[PDB]
Amino acid sequence: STKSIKYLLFVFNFVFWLAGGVILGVALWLRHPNTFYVGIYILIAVGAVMMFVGFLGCYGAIQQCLLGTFFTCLVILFACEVAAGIWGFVNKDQIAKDVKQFYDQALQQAVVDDDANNAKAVVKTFHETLDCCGSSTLTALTTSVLKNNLCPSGSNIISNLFKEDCHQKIDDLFSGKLYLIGIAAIVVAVIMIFEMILSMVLSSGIRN
Numbered sequence: 588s589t590k591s592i593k594y595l596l597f598v599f600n601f602v603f604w605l606a607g608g609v610i611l612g613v614a615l616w617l618r619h620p621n622t623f624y625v626g627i628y629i630l631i632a633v634g635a636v637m638m639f640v641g642f643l644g645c646y647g648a649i650q651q652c653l654l655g656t657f658f659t660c661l662v663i664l665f666a667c668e669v670a671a672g673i674w675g676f677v678n679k680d681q682i683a684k685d686v687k688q689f690y691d692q693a694l695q696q697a698v699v700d701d702d703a704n705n706a707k708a709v710v711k712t713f714h715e716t717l718d719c720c721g722s723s724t725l726t727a728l729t730t731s732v733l734k735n736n737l738c739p740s741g742s743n744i745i746s747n748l749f750k751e752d753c754h755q756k757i758d759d760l761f762s763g764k765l766y767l768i769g770i771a772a773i774v775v776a777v778i779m780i781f782e783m784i785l786s787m788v789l790s791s792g793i794r795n
């Protein structure tokens with residue numbers, strides 16, 4: 588094949604193959620009162636989908652069924668994104684309250700149970716991503732005074748009583764910051780159609 592743009596897809600999907608394997612491997616590490624595990628299995632499914640889809644896309648450099656299956660994977664994923672996009676939009680508070688309950692159970696097990704490497708890693712990343720600590724402003728104090736290894740960066744104890752907690756940012760992420768999720772969703776939508784067109788171009792180009 589003459590076109591090197593077909594050769595680009597191998598590197599692009601191989602990134603998501605390793606990312607799929609890492610996300611799958613990290614999700615299994617977090618697996619190591621079920622709502623916290625309910626959110627963990629979503630990461631297991633996401634990590635497994637990105638692995639086998641990233642497998643077909645990456646291994647598409649070998650050049651077929653393999654490539655044709657990869658194109659069908661992008662079509663079904665695009666239709667499920669539309670379904671998850673419209674439904675997730677109309678139920679924006681349903682998943683928001685579920686992210687709350689996920690964060691609440693993760694924070695409880697991280698503070699009370701000191702041997703919970705999974706609960707700490709989840710809440711710590713939630714803290715570094717949202718600049719929060721504790722569920723309520725009272726939980727911000729209990730976490731900062733006791734389990735300060737969870738609060739993000741060098742945030743002191745006094746700085747958490749005035750800052751907004753995660754139960755404020757989780758809602759603000761879904762309410763005011765829904766434009767951010769819309770961007771990320773469309774970004775996934777435009778890279779799917781871009782890989783879809785480039786997949787049938789590769790199939791029409793590999794014919795020699």
Ligand SMILES: CC(C)CCC[C@@H](C)[C@H]1CC[C@H]2[C@@H]3CC=C4C[C@@H](O)CC[C@]4(C)[C@H]3CC[C@]12C
Nearest residue numbers: 600603629633636637640641644671775779782
């Ligand atoms: C389970 C729901 C509610 C959470 C959202 C899951 C999303 C973020 C996950 C699940 C499946 C994932 C996709 C799986 C396959 C591909 C094709 C690949 O070439 C680019 C990455 C891409 C497009 C992944 C993007 C992220 C993805 C869409």
